């Protein structure tokens, strides 16, 4: 229950990661949370949209790396199987699967100040979300290597250019952005809206579905590496 | 009789929309004679480049509502199997298949002041031009996302940046560059352009065809929707 | 042994083409030099990165015309299916296989004053590289086309809005940020940056194998045709 649910506007659901003391880190209830708003939105004939947030100036940092990653493959073949459009908004960190469950979002906002990031190679993993097949299609292979083979952090207008935002906002303006774009979605004939979504999907759509499961097996063969079990130990200090 | 074409230039055919009381709106006609100057032109020996531009600082706003959509879809199955190298030029409106037969010439300019857009949602209906496979792949998924899904009214510089545009003149200047373009074009070793073309579009081909096949289908249905009906007459006022 | 081969630091060979007279131009042996040097850095369990360029700011301009283009192959192959990071860094003249071959490291910087060209179609020949199936997946058909088919010079700023490199930097700056990437890319675990490389590269891997295949048997038969002969008796005035 750090997962908020409320119908914002007609038609429009606004799902809001809220754990800010832990930088919205995804809890194994968050996933299983986020997979219920999901599932229940679609379901909602109700509802048209949605808008995907985290609380307090913050997106999320990721997997909690507390509270194996099937949980998460559940999410992510969840999140990139909805029929409704999904629109994220973000401020602040947006880390891990914070930066790749944008590649399923239909449209994605953050405000100056947001800070993205792919750590997975440098924790000795490997990468998930199938970022390792849509981030070279989105962004171009020489941006994909240095984003997920060096692990680098960066800004919005980098994440705008590597296909991953539609427009940068003022900070703490990517929300109201988010919404006015979810409305005009919502004002929009929705069947119409759908057919659009799953055409413009329909050719990727079996290659992601398919790399989420291969990610996902090599994923966690890495967690039992030992460069995964020294780089954890080096990751904390 | 609404399609002027003329030899303008040694080895470049212009072919131009010409209809300006209507916006070089696209009767059914049109389309049958944007069909026969093309077919003309790739058999026609003397000729190595296209040049495709509306008259009268306009483009096109795209299908005529009074003068189904087979037509539409064998000018682009004509458009997108043209050997010939084609370069369009585009000033004021470029709407509905004014924007996505952009995406089967093999250069476009416009000038400054240019308007796109793809209102098919709008009208209840669904992508066509085979712009759902060809978009995403070109402009990056959000961006097809926002103008398709969306429907975004959208000017040259997103044009430019969502690939369906090489470069932006200022206004009343993309005839020019085209020229030059195609006369550029025109003086290469033909046989080797051509070879190129065929190569560069080798590996799309195949999903175009049946991409506009099944959009056309899908169009066909969205025709008799009650949303197209809704939108129509909303449409009108 | 026109190709340079040296540790110049922990785990990171650079591997340089030197013949400033001839603008590093690529002899037969020089395709096999560099064959060897990639070979020998994939076998060797000491080297975690390679970073390639060329002496006396130049990067090469390309296939030596005098010193059939199986060789050229060979290598392309090799350099497209190593397994370990490949970070290019790029003064001066990087034409024909100059640029072509970039689209197979995982990394590329060029300074200021950068040339960058693929005159093929110019010469009457036909894309090589796998140019033909990557380019417009990185740089959108549009600028492929302007690229491939036009044959058009372009410079460093170009070059990155086409995908082809990561960061421009300022003239005779490549070298330093591409050995700086490379020691950022050998400090991370190096079995989870291959990969994260081969996962990168395992929806292209194929397509790339076939197309170099395809275009290096239509590139030989464009060596015979007369536009070929009449091109090249052109280029020599």
Known sequence: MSILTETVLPGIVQITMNRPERKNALDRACYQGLIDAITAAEADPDIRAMVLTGAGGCFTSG???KDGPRVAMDYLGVLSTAKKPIVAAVEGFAVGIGTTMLLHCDLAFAGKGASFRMPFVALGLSPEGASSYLLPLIAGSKRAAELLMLGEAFG???????G????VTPEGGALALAIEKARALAALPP?????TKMLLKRAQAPAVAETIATEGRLF???LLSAEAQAAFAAFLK
């Open 164 to 167: 991953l935002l539609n427009a």
């Open 156 to 162: 919005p207008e980098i994440a705008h250019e590597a």
């Open 63 to 65: 997997n909690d790396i």
């Open 191 to 195: 069947q119409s809206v759908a057919l």
């Open 220 to 222: 966690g063969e890495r």
